[PDB]
Structure formats: C-alpha cells, structure tokens
Amino acid sequence: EGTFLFTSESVGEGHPDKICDQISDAVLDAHLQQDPDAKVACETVAKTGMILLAGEITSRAAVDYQKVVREAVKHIGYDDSSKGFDYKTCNVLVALEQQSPDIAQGVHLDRNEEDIGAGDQGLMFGYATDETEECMPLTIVLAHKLNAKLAELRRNGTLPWLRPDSKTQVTVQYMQDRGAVLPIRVHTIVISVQHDEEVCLDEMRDALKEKVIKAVVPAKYLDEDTIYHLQPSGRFVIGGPQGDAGLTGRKIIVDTYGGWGAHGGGAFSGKDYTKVDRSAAYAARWVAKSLVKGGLCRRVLVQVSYAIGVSHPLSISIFHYGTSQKSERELLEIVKKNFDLRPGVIVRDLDLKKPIYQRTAAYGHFGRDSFPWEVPKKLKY
Amino acid sequence: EGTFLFTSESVGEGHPDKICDQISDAVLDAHLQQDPDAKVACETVAKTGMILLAGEITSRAAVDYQKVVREAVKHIGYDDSSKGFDYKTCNVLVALEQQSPDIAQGVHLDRNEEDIGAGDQGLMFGYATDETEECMPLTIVLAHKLNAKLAELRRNGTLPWLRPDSKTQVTVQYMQDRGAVLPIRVHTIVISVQHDEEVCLDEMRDALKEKVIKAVVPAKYLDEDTIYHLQPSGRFVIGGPQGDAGLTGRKIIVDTYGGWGAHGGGAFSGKDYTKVDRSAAYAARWVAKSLVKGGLCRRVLVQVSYAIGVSHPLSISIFHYGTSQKSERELLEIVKKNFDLRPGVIVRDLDLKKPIYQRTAAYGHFGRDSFPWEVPKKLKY
Ligand SMILES: [C]OC1=[C][C]=C(C2=N([O])C([C])=[C]C3=C2C2=[C]C(O[C])=[C][C]=C2O3)[C]=[C]1
Ligand SMILES: [C]OC1=[C][C]=C(C2=N([O])C([C])=[C]C3=C2C2=[C]C(O[C])=[C][C]=C2O3)[C]=[C]1
Ligand SMILES: CSC[C@H]1O[C@@H](n2cnc3c(N)ncnc32)[C@H](O)[C@@H]1O
Ligand SMILES: CSC[C@H]1O[C@@H](n2cnc3c(N)ncnc32)[C@H](O)[C@@H]1O
Ligand SMILES: [Cl-]
Ligand SMILES: [Cl-]
Ligand SMILES: [Cl-]
Ligand SMILES: [Cl-]
Ligand SMILES: [Cl-]
Ligand SMILES: [Cl-]
Numbered sequence: 155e156g157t158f159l160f161t162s163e164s165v166g167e168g169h170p171d172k173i174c175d176q177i178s179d180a181v182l183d184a185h186l187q188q189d190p191d192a193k194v195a196c197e198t199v200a201k202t203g204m205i206l207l208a209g210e211i212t213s214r215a216a217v218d219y220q221k222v223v224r225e226a227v228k229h230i231g232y233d234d235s236s237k238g239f240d241y242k243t244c245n246v247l248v249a250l251e252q253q254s255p256d257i258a259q260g261v262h263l264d265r266n267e268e269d270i271g272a273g274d275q276g277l278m279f280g281y282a283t284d285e286t287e288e289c290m291p292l293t294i295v296l297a298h299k300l301n302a303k304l305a306e307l308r309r310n311g312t313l314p315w316l317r318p319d320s321k322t323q324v325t326v327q328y329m330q331d332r333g334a335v336l337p338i339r340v341h342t343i344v345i346s347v348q349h350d351e352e353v354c355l356d357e358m359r360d361a362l363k364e365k366v367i368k369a370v371v372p373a374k375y376l377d378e379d380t381i382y383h384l385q386p387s388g389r390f391v392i393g394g395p396q397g398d399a400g401l402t403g404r405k406i407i408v409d410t411y412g413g414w415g416a417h418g419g420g421a422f423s424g425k426d427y428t429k430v431d432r433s434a435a436y437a438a439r440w441v442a443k444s445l446v447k448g449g450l451c452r453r454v455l456v457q458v459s460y461a462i463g464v465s466h467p468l469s470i471s472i473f474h475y476g477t478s479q480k481s482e483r484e485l486l487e488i489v490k491k492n493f494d495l496r497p498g499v500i501v502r503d504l505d506l507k508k509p510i511y512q513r514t515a516a517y518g519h520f521g522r523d524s525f526p527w528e529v530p531k532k533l534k535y
Numbered sequence: 536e537g538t539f540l541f542t543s544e545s546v547g548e549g550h551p552d553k554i555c556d557q558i559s560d561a562v563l564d565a566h567l568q569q570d571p572d573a574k575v576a577c578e579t580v581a582k583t584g585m586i587l588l589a590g591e592i593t594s595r596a597a598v599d600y601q602k603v604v605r606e607a608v609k610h611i612g613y614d615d616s617s618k619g620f621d622y623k624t625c626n627v628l629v630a631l632e633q634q635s636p637d638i639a640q641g642v643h644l645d646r647n648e649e650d651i652g653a654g655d656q657g658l659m660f661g662y663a664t665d666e667t668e669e670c671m672p673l674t675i676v677l678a679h680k681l682n683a684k685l686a687e688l689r690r691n692g693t694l695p696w697l698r699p700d701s702k703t704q705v706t707v708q709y710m711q712d713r714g715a716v717l718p719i720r721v722h723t724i725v726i727s728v729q730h731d732e733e734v735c736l737d738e739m740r741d742a743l744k745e746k747v748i749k750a751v752v753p754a755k756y757l758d759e760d761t762i763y764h765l766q767p768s769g770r771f772v773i774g775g776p777q778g779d780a781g782l783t784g785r786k787i788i789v790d791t792y793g794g795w796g797a798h799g800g801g802a803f804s805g806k807d808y809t810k811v812d813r814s815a816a817y818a819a820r821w822v823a824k825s826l827v828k829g830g831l832c833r834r835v836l837v838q839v840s841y842a843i844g845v846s847h848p849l850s851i852s853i854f855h856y857g858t859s860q861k862s863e864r865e866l867l868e869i870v871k872k873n874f875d876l877r878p879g880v881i882v883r884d885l886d887l888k889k890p891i892y893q894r895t896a897a898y899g900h901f902g903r904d905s906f907p908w909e910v911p912k913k914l915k916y
Binding site for chain 1: 576585637638722770787850
C-alpha cells in the first residue's frame with residue numbers, strides 16, 4: 155500500500171544512438187580545443203559501415219574529421235569486422251556547412267557575450283531527488299552502472315565474448331514520503347549485450363547475474379522474487395550500427411532522468427553552449443541540485459524556456475512535489491536572486507567552452523564526475 | 536498564489552526534424568499498403584539537398600523510395616530552389632538493409648501473433664488531462680494549432696510569403712485544483728516561420744498577431760500583459776534542411792505531451808507495431824484517456840515497460856495526481872481487467888497494420904482526429 159513501480163533504461167557506449175552522441179561531442183571538443191567560440195550543430199548517423207556527419211559548424215579550427223570520428227569509434231571498441239564495425243575501415247561521410255547567416259545574425263553576431271540570444275526557442279527541465287547522494291533516481295543510476303560494468307569487463311578481458319553494444323533496464327519498487335520517493339527493492343532487471351559466436355547463452359546469463367548484476371546492485375535490493383531478463387532475445391551477435399541505425403539525440407531520456415522529472419525534447423550532443431537545449435538543461439540541473447543539496451527541498455522540478463535571439467528565459471517554474479516548507483513562489487525568488495540563466499552567463503558559470511563534452515555522451519549527463527552543473531551553488535536568501 | 540507557468544512547443548510540417556518523421560512514416564505506410572506484416576525501422580536524415588533513408592526493412596512490398604520520399608516532400612511544400620529545398624531535384628540516398636535475423640528470431644519468427652515479443656526493451660508513458668475536451672494540455676494544443684494555421688494560410692495563398700519551416704511556443708499560467716490543472720491565461724507566445732525575401736519584418740509580425748494568433752487563441756486567454764515574440768530572430772529566409780539538419784525522432788515531446796506527463800525516450804515514426812516505442816505508447820495514451828473519459832480521474836500518468844522478446848509488460852504503474860477517489864492500486868486492477876498490453880494484442884485493438892502513420896507525423900500523435908487510441912474504451916469494473 156502506497157508503493158509503486160518505476161522503470162528506467164540505459165545503454166552502453168556501443169549502442170548505435172550513443173555512438174552518434176559520442177562522435178558528435180568528439181567533433182564539438184575538437185573544434186573547442188582550437189576555437190572556444192566555435193558554433194557547432196553536428197548530427198551523426200551510423201549504419202553498417204557508415205558514419206555520416208550532417209549539420210552546421212562555423213569555426214576557426216582546422217579539424218581532421220576522419221581522425222576525430224575514427225578515434226571515437228576506436229575508444230568505443232569497434233575495431234574489427236568480426237564485431238560488425240571497424241574504425242580503421244568504415245566509411246566517414248561529411249555533409250557539414252557553415253551556420254545559417256540568418257541564425258548567426260539573430261543569435262550572436264555583434265552581441266555582447268552576456269547578451270547573446272538563445273540559439274533556438276525551446277523548453278528545458280532540471281530535476282533532483284535526495285534518494286541518492288548524486289541526487290538522481292536510483293532506477294537510472296543502476297541502469298547506467300550495469301552498462302559501465304559491461305564495458306569494464308569487456309575492456310579488462312574478464313568477459314572477452316562481450317561486444318560494445320548493450321542495453322539495460324531497471325524496475326524499482328518505491329514508497330512515497332510527503333512527495334519524496336524511497337526505493338525499497340529491485341523488481342526486474344533486463345540486460346541485452348552484443349556477444350561473439352563462441353559463447354553459449356547459459357554462460358552469458360550466469361556471467362550477467364554473477365559478474366555484472368551482483369557487482370553493481372546492492373544485495374539489500376535483490377530477493378528471491380526479483381525478475382531477471384538476461385539476453386532475453388536469445389541471440390545478439392549482430393549489433394552496433396549493423397543491427398540498428400543510430401542517430402544523435404535519440405537517447406535523451408537515458409541522457410537525463412530515466413523518465414523521472416520531465417523533458418523538453420532537446421538533444422545535448424554536438425551542440426555548443428549557445429544552443430540552450432544543452433546549456434539551459436545543464437543550468438536547470440544545477441539549479442535543481444542546488445535546491446536539494448541546499449536543504450530547501452527533497453525533490454524538485456525546474457522548467458525554463460527561451461525564444462531564439464532573446465537572452466533571458468521567457469518562463470521559469472519550480473515544483474517541489476510538496477517536499478519544501480517554502481512555497482514554490484519563495485523558491486522561484488531564491489532562484490531569481492542566485493542564478494542568471496542567460497546562455498552568455500551560464501557559459502561563464504559552467505565553463506561551457508571547455509572541451510569536456512565527449513565525457514558527457516555516455517552514462518548520462520547528470521549525477522556523475524562533479525561536472526560544473528553537479529557542484530551545488532551556495533544559495534543566499 | 537497557487538499559480539504556475541508551463542511552456543510547450545510545436546513545429547510545422549517543414550521543420551527539418553518533422554520532415555524526417557513524415558518521410559519515415561510515408562515509407563512505413565508504403566510498405567503496409569502491400570505487406571501488412573512489414574518489419575520497418577526507417578530513419579530519415581535531411582540536410583541541404585539530401586534525404587537519406589537509413590535502417591532496416593523486411594517486407595514483401597515493392598516500394599519506389601524515390602516516389603514515396605519526393606511525394607512526401609511535395610506535400611510538405613518544398614517545391615522550388617527559392618524555398619531552399621525541392622522534391623523534384625533533391626538527392627534521395629538509401630542505406631536500407633533487412634531486419635537483423637538475430638532480432639527477428641528473438642521477437643517474431645515462429646511466434647503466434649498475440650504472443651510476439653516486444654521488438655525492443657523500453658519504457659513508455661501515457662497521459663491524459665481533463666483541461667481540454669481532447670484530454671491534452673492546452674499549451675501543446677495551442678502550439679500545434681498555431682503551426683496548422685500557418686500551413687493553412689500558406690496553402691490557401693492568404694500569406695504567400697510563408698515557407699513550410701515553422702516553430703511555435705506557448706506559455707500558459709495555470710492554477711491547480713486537487714491535482715487537476717486549470718489554464719487561466721496565455722503568458723507568452725513565440726512564432727518563428729521561414730519566409731521569402733520580399734516581405735518586411737513589420738508586415739510579418741502584424742500578420743502573425745492578427746491572422747495567426749487571433750485566429751487560434753481565444754481572446755479570453757489574451758490580455759495587455761501577454762508577451763509576443765514574433766519572428767524574434769529578425770530574419771528566417773534560409774530554412775528547412777538547409778538551415779538545420781533534421782533527423783527522425785528528434786521531436787518526441789512535440790509528438791506527445793509538450794513536457795507534461797513523462798516520456799520514456801522512444802521515437803514513433805518509421806516503426807511498425809512490433810516496436811513497442813510506438814504501439815505501447817499509443818496503448819498507454821488509450822488507457823490514460825479511457826480513465827479520464829470514464830470519469831475515474833481528472834488527470835493520469837501511465838507507465839509500462841518491456842523486454843525485447845517478451846510479450847507482456849514487465850511493469851505497469853498508474854499515478855492519478857490525487858484526482859481519483861480510487862487508489863492507484865484499484866486503477867491498476869481496472870486497467871489489468873480491461874486491457875491486454877501485449878504488442879500482438881494492441882495491434883488488433885488499435886488496428887496498427889493500417890497505413891495511417893504519415894497522418895500522425897505532424898501536429899502530435901495524440902489529441903486529434905479520433906485515431907483508435909483516441910477513442911476511449913468503455914471500462915468494466
Ligand atoms: C515523471 O515521473 C514521476 C511522476 C510522479 C511520480 C509519483 N510521485 O511523485 C508521487 C509523489 C507519488 C507517486 C508517483 C507515482 C508514479 C506512478 O507511475 C508513473 C505510480 C504511482 C505513483 O505514486 C513518480 C514519477
Ligand atoms: C511533468 O509536468 C508537470 C509535473 C507537475 C506539475 C504540477 N502539478 O501536477 C501540480 C499538481 C502542481 C504544480 C505543478 C507544477 C509545475 C511547475 O513547474 C514545472 C511549477 C509549479 C507547479 O505546481 C505540472 C506539470
Ligand atoms: C532491438 S534494436 C534496438 C537496440 O536493441 C539492441 N539490439 C540489437 N540487436 C539485438 C538483439 N539481437 N537482441 C537484443 N537487443 C538487440 C541494440 O542496442 C539496438 O540498438
Ligand atoms: C535555430 S535552428 C533550429 C530550428 O529553428 C528554426 N530556424 C532555422 N533558422 C531560423 C532562423 N533564422 N530564425 C528562427 N528560427 C530558425 C528551424 O525550424 C530549425 O530547424
Ligand atoms: Cl575519442
Ligand atoms: Cl546514494
Ligand atoms: Cl544573479
Ligand atoms: Cl506523401
Ligand atoms: Cl476543450
Ligand atoms: Cl484483457
């Protein structure tokens with residue numbers, strides 16, 4: 155009574171959509187290393203034997219797209235035709251043009267940096283929950299950690315039959331406490347991972363339970379009733395882009411809160427800070443985490459929105475789920491007194507010209523590695 | 536006091552991401568017209584002069600991709616190099632292969648149709664709100680209708696300077712009533728639309744207020760304080776794929792609830808019913824709308840989740856926001872007694888082999904045209 159199930163998923167570095175996010179952000183980083191003011195909107199498409207870059211870049215950088223793309227694919231682990239994809243021998247196609255001059259003139263040309271317009275309209279949410287130290291939903295944290303564990307055991311040669319493409323999914327039973335949520339138990343785990351032609355299904359299922367799940371999920375959450383769907387398709391030899399076409403910005407819920415909170419639809423990867431889809435979403439996470447770590451609420455949702463060419467947000471909204479003694483109006487006044495959510499100020503506060511974006515493009519953008527948006531602001535009120 | 540702002544956006548038929556959704560669904564429909572059991576996973580990429588199809592189709596259909604793609608672009612209105620894109624003369628590139636045999640064997644081969652596995656893992660939400668007759672958030676309904684009005688005035692020659700690429704955004708001030716939400720006023724409207732080189736900015740801004748906003752938004756929601764950002768970039772001559780690379784499944788919040796409810800991350804367009812990203816999301820909307828229209832709640836969120844190769848959902852969750860006298864446990868029992876959320880049963884209930892998908896791929900998948908998932912089920916309990 156008063157309990158509910160909630161499910162989140164994550165994917166591995168070799169999931170074809172995630173390959174595209176990582177390549178898009180490798181391209182962004184390569185530009186920012188030479189030109190901190192590069193305007194980048196780099197979409198990636200992946201299918202059998204092909205990486206295509208499509209989009210708009212205006213930059214002073216001299217970037218070797220062949221090297222940047224192939225080094226990203228090498229890092230992921232696609233290094234042989236036996237695995238379905240090889241950085242050494244794949245096709246890299248480029249359909250990149252300058253940023254539209256109409257966008258440039260409306261957003262940033264002859265603008266003071268602090269007063270640059272939003273690079274697009276849109277809406278963005280931030281979310282934080284006190285249910286974990288990293289202020290993230292346990293469902294998504296566990297799902298990410300299961301993919302990270304697969305990559306670790308592949309890379310260290312423990313499970314050498316593993317290939318880079320994986321997906322995981324975690325269902326947790328929760329109770330509610332005055333709008334806060336408390337995780338009780340893991341109800342169901344799914345793991346699907348690409349594998350070689352030698353290993354049999356029983357060996358894989360045993361290894362996924364004993365060397366992956368048991369190495370990630372605390373035993374206090376697992377019981378005799380927990381349901382395991384391990385290699386539920388029965389065979390996953392074909393994988394990566396050969397199994398499924400990938401695109402940049404097709405894992406936006408994996409990238410954020412795993413179904414919790416809300417999403418405004420904007421993808422992160424391949425975009426410089428003037429694209430508020432990324433900078434304002436990072437800032438909204440920073441606000442949400444600052445409110446929870448500051449002790450003002452246990453759980454909070456922040457919405458912001460923008461118009462192309464306009465610096466200041468068009469709307470700011472705060473929902474505390476009943477977990478603050480302060481009114482949502484009082485929290486909004488604290489946020490307005492402590493934060494400046496113009497993209498040309500967010501860039502300074504969160505250091506968003508730094509080429510750290512490829513690091514964000516797997517295992518979620520939030521809840522790890524003390525990125526600037528994960529370091530709470532000390533609030534004055 | 537007790538009021539809040541909430542923002543949603545929509546895009547027009549010529550927005551490059553939406554072009555891709557419509558082409559992906561034109562391809563799906565072309566297959567289903569000949570082979571109701573076609574397995575389709577068709578991604579589309581659009582950039583200057585290029586439509587690329589990438590993905591996996593196993594089908595008995597004989598499909599002319601050149602004709603299907605070009606007819607979709609013609610319908611959208613890109614018919615001349617002056618508009619930045621022309622169905623007659625663009626490049627159509629195809630990178631389509633058979634569905635992975637590993638997926639096919641794990642999902643549907645030698646399966647009874649009712650007992651087909653989910654085509655992937657994932658999570659999906661349904662949402663419904665009594666704030667409009669169509670059980671959708673007013674923010675998203677108004678945003679969609681503003682884009683539909685632009686297309687209408689372009690196509691009827693009223694505003695012949697209009698081009699197909701548009702975006703809109705609506706901020707509404709709401710009050711809450713025991714978990715239900717009541718829209719009070721329109722706080723801010725954004726409209727950006729591609730235009731010709733002849734029309735001046737003041738003519739466009741006047742027309743967008745008088746012939747678009749006033750023709751869509753009831754005057755009772757507008758006042759002297761309503762903020763209008765009309766052509767806020769100042770110039771939008773370059774547009775469509777020339778202005779911004781488009782991809783299938785990059786408008787998933789426009790396609791659904793405009794930030795309300797929740798999203799599990801799955802894109803709809805280009806996918807047959809075995810892909811639960813589409814079929815289970817449609818079924819979850821159907822459940823949510825059935826609960827609200829059945830008088831069991833004013834507002835409701837439904838989560839379901841799946842594992843690849845497994846027919847039945849792994850989890851089902853119901854949140855009524857405090858708007859039911861029934862417990863969320865009692866609502867879950869009503870749902871379990873009235874619905875079968877296996878994809879091989881959803882296909883029968885919602886007629887998902889019918890080639891109606893291109894019609895879903897602009898102006899939202901929900902809240903219009905009495906699609907099967909918009910016709911409430913009469914509930915027995
Ligand atoms: C988005 O995201 C989410 C939302 C909401 C939630 C919740 N909250 O918050 C509270 C307080 C309580 C509850 C809930 C739920 C949900 C469900 O399903 C979906 C069921 C039941 C329940 O209960 C969560 C999550
Ligand atoms: C997702 O989606 C959403 C969620 C939630 C909501 C709400 N609910 O429900 C209630 C009852 C009340 C409230 C809310 C809000 C929000 C905000 O922002 C975001 C602010 C404030 C407020 O309040 C909505 C929407
Ligand atoms: C079902 S295709 C969608 C995603 O599922 C994964 N996938 C691909 N092939 C299989 C398979 N044979 N079994 C399980 N998951 C798969 C890959 O991560 C792919 O991007
Ligand atoms: C800002 S690029 C993202 C989207 O905004 C729109 N857009 C493109 N160019 C402009 C412009 N000059 N002004 C306003 N919106 C634009 C198009 O719909 C594009 O897909
Ligand atoms: Cl790299
Ligand atoms: Cl923790
Ligand atoms: Cl400030
Ligand atoms: Cl058509
Ligand atoms: Cl209505
Ligand atoms: Cl039933």
